[PDB]
């Protein structure tokens, strides 16, 4: 039958590769929260960057650029915290 599932790769400012399963019916905001719990970083303090440009809250699934395994750059400005 039908199906829909695709994981993404996020790279933290500390050079950490993380994998998370997501669906095209999801959004950046939701993904950010998932990663936050994955390790324990502030989603409101972290941001996504692709090729140099930042990714909005809907710039991911709806954008039609989410695949089973995509490489994205994640930069967080924690400077010391959880």
PDB file of C-alpha atoms in Angstrom:
ATOM      1  CA  UNK A   1       0.000   0.000   0.000  1.00  0.00           C
ATOM      2  CA  UNK A   2       0.882   3.703   0.328  1.00  0.00           C
ATOM      3  CA  UNK A   3       3.550   5.148   2.621  1.00  0.00           C
ATOM      4  CA  UNK A   4       5.393   8.315   3.596  1.00  0.00           C
ATOM      5  CA  UNK A   5       8.554   8.633   5.675  1.00  0.00           C
ATOM      6  CA  UNK A   6      11.884  10.412   5.210  1.00  0.00           C
ATOM      7  CA  UNK A   7      14.689  11.185   7.661  1.00  0.00           C
ATOM      8  CA  UNK A   8      16.978  14.221   7.598  1.00  0.00           C
ATOM      9  CA  UNK A   9      20.552  14.940   8.682  1.00  0.00           C
ATOM     10  CA  UNK A  10      21.310  17.920  10.920  1.00  0.00           C
ATOM     11  CA  UNK A  11      24.812  19.244  11.587  1.00  0.00           C
ATOM     12  CA  UNK A  12      25.297  21.164  14.835  1.00  0.00           C
ATOM     13  CA  UNK A  13      27.744  24.057  15.174  1.00  0.00           C
ATOM     14  CA  UNK A  14      29.892  21.601  17.129  1.00  0.00           C
ATOM     15  CA  UNK A  15      30.098  19.313  14.113  1.00  0.00           C
ATOM     16  CA  UNK A  16      27.566  16.677  15.144  1.00  0.00           C
ATOM     17  CA  UNK A  17      25.630  14.590  12.622  1.00  0.00           C
ATOM     18  CA  UNK A  18      22.140  13.645  13.800  1.00  0.00           C
ATOM     19  CA  UNK A  19      19.426  11.661  12.021  1.00  0.00           C
ATOM     20  CA  UNK A  20      15.687  12.149  12.506  1.00  0.00           C
ATOM     21  CA  UNK A  21      12.686  10.605  10.750  1.00  0.00           C
ATOM     22  CA  UNK A  22      10.158  13.089   9.367  1.00  0.00           C
ATOM     23  CA  UNK A  23       7.247  13.266   6.927  1.00  0.00           C
ATOM     24  CA  UNK A  24       6.587  15.630   4.021  1.00  0.00           C
ATOM     25  CA  UNK A  25       3.442  16.557   5.950  1.00  0.00           C
ATOM     26  CA  UNK A  26       5.612  18.056   8.689  1.00  0.00           C
ATOM     27  CA  UNK A  27       7.414  21.387   9.037  1.00  0.00           C
ATOM     28  CA  UNK A  28      10.734  22.897  10.118  1.00  0.00           C
ATOM     29  CA  UNK A  29       9.325  24.036  13.448  1.00  0.00           C
ATOM     30  CA  UNK A  30       8.250  20.509  14.352  1.00  0.00           C
ATOM     31  CA  UNK A  31      11.637  19.142  13.291  1.00  0.00           C
ATOM     32  CA  UNK A  32      13.495  21.667  15.444  1.00  0.00           C
ATOM     33  CA  UNK A  33      11.592  20.435  18.498  1.00  0.00           C
ATOM     34  CA  UNK A  34      12.480  16.817  17.733  1.00  0.00           C
ATOM     35  CA  UNK A  35      16.192  17.636  17.603  1.00  0.00           C
ATOM     36  CA  UNK A  36      15.933  19.632  20.828  1.00  0.00           C
ATOM     37  CA  UNK A  37      14.808  16.539  22.734  1.00  0.00           C
ATOM     38  CA  UNK A  38      17.233  14.331  20.806  1.00  0.00           C
ATOM     39  CA  UNK A  39      20.191  16.020  22.500  1.00  0.00           C
ATOM     40  CA  UNK A  40      18.854  18.863  24.623  1.00  0.00           C
ATOM     41  CA  UNK A  41      19.413  22.188  22.880  1.00  0.00           C
ATOM     42  CA  UNK A  42      17.253  25.336  22.624  1.00  0.00           C
ATOM     43  CA  UNK A  43      15.266  25.306  19.354  1.00  0.00           C
ATOM     44  CA  UNK A  44      14.572  29.034  19.649  1.00  0.00           C
ATOM     45  CA  UNK A  45      18.313  29.684  19.872  1.00  0.00           C
ATOM     46  CA  UNK A  46      19.217  27.375  16.988  1.00  0.00           C
ATOM     47  CA  UNK A  47      18.702  27.995  13.271  1.00  0.00           C
ATOM     48  CA  UNK A  48      18.954  26.060  10.005  1.00  0.00           C
ATOM     49  CA  UNK A  49      21.086  26.994   6.999  1.00  0.00           C
ATOM     50  CA  UNK A  50      21.183  25.525   3.492  1.00  0.00           C
ATOM     51  CA  UNK A  51      23.831  26.674   1.032  1.00  0.00           C
ATOM     52  CA  UNK A  52      24.131  29.844   3.077  1.00  0.00           C
ATOM     53  CA  UNK A  53      20.488  30.876   3.363  1.00  0.00           C
ATOM     54  CA  UNK A  54      18.395  30.237   6.474  1.00  0.00           C
ATOM     55  CA  UNK A  55      15.349  27.957   6.463  1.00  0.00           C
ATOM     56  CA  UNK A  56      11.959  29.270   7.581  1.00  0.00           C
ATOM     57  CA  UNK A  57       9.526  27.330   9.768  1.00  0.00           C
ATOM     58  CA  UNK A  58       7.926  25.864   6.643  1.00  0.00           C
ATOM     59  CA  UNK A  59      11.153  25.694   4.636  1.00  0.00           C
ATOM     60  CA  UNK A  60      11.663  21.926   4.635  1.00  0.00           C
ATOM     61  CA  UNK A  61       8.761  19.548   4.011  1.00  0.00           C
ATOM     62  CA  UNK A  62       6.357  21.899   2.232  1.00  0.00           C
ATOM     63  CA  UNK A  63       9.342  23.315   0.348  1.00  0.00           C
ATOM     64  CA  UNK A  64       9.623  19.897  -1.299  1.00  0.00           C
ATOM     65  CA  UNK A  65      13.304  19.444  -0.456  1.00  0.00           C
ATOM     66  CA  UNK A  66      13.017  16.804   2.268  1.00  0.00           C
ATOM     67  CA  UNK A  67      14.380  13.381   1.331  1.00  0.00           C
ATOM     68  CA  UNK A  68      15.165  10.088   3.066  1.00  0.00           C
ATOM     69  CA  UNK A  69      18.575  11.580   3.849  1.00  0.00           C
ATOM     70  CA  UNK A  70      19.341  15.269   3.328  1.00  0.00           C
ATOM     71  CA  UNK A  71      22.397  17.199   4.514  1.00  0.00           C
ATOM     72  CA  UNK A  72      21.558  20.425   6.347  1.00  0.00           C
ATOM     73  CA  UNK A  73      23.701  22.857   8.338  1.00  0.00           C
ATOM     74  CA  UNK A  74      22.443  23.672  11.835  1.00  0.00           C
ATOM     75  CA  UNK A  75      24.006  26.599  13.693  1.00  0.00           C
ATOM     76  CA  UNK A  76      23.123  27.169  17.348  1.00  0.00           C
ATOM     77  CA  UNK A  77      24.243  30.115  19.476  1.00  0.00           C
ATOM     78  CA  UNK A  78      24.221  28.456  22.899  1.00  0.00           C
ATOM     79  CA  UNK A  79      27.599  29.693  24.133  1.00  0.00           C
ATOM     80  CA  UNK A  80      27.137  27.494  27.189  1.00  0.00           C
ATOM     81  CA  UNK A  81      23.923  25.933  28.435  1.00  0.00           C
ATOM     82  CA  UNK A  82      21.774  22.807  28.590  1.00  0.00           C
TER      83      UNK A  82
END
